[model samples]
Target: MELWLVRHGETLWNREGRLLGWTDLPLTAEGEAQARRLKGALPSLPAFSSDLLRARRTAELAGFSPRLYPEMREIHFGALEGALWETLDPRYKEALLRFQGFHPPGGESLSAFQERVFRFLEGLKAPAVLFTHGGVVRAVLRALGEDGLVPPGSAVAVDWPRRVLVRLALD
Candidate 1:
């Protein structure tokens, strides 16, 4: 089955380039517009979402009241939670660049986070829409043997295991 993944709209933290993991922030005004625009682009199907306000609100604005799941949340940034990317210590930045064997002081390991994301994907029984985050999208792409980050209000459709069908960004 195909999984339709959508990264939620922008948040204030996003505009500031802050690490936004499980922070429960709302979408910015432009973000709300982006979400509303998604209504015409995505399928009107049953959906699922990360249980964060931004994602939930995005799903709502996009015309879906998705089943919520904490499992779909963004990578927990731990001690680096609100850190700006440009100001991050080189050590942590390098660790993130490698994408393995690194865990922020109070957050989760990359492996563990990937496992959680895959576990959620594996639990799905059919095609569905997922209102999630950029990190979640990156994890899905990584698992599918690809790499890159999707923008807010972007929708990527992929076949289970490893095949990208299409990716759309409603800018």
Candidate 2:
């Protein structure tokens, strides 16, 4: 059983370093190309998403008629959805530091996301590709004992016909 967990391509807000949590933003031209590239590379892999437009679009462009899962969507930003980072205070950071228990204003608690991530993994079938976000990748990697790897969802662009970015090197 093999699982290819990929991050979605870039967006305009992504280029500007803005938070895209639950925003339903579409990918830029480059992002579309990135999706196309992935599609060309992985011709046989089936895809799935978090029931969000961004992920769903990527999956479609990448040649997968993805099965959407409400449980797989990105974290809801709440009041922070489009808010700039400079305006945030220590309390916000504190909330993040609380781990799964933390809940920022209008944001979904990390705890909730953790539970969903676990459920998603438990139900995953092998030899599939996941068209999701950085948060999803981060959650899964952590659950798989790869805690040191930060979110790699933004790096989904790969060469066609064999776009293999992650090569597990067992020590």
Summarize candidate 1's per-residue lDDT along 29-117 as a digit string, tens digits. 99999999999799876799999999999999999989999999999999889999999988888977767777888998888899999
Give the lowest summed-lDDT range of ten residues in model 1. Answer: 139-148
In order, the Cα lDDT scores of the candidates are: 0.90, 0.65
* Alpha-carbon RMSD of each model: 1.1, 6.1
Q: Output the number of the lDDT-best candidate.
A: 1
Expressed as tens digits, the lDDT of each residue in 23-70 for candidate 2 is 888888877777766665654676778787778887888788878887
Clashing pairs in 2: 7-153, 41-161, 78-106
- State the local distance difference test value for candidate 2: 0.65
- The residue ranges of model 2 lying beyond 4 angstroms of the native Cα positions read 94-100, 147-171
Clashes of 2: 3
Residue pairs with colliding backbones in model 1 are: none
Give the CA lDDT, 0 to 100, for residue 120 in model 1.
93
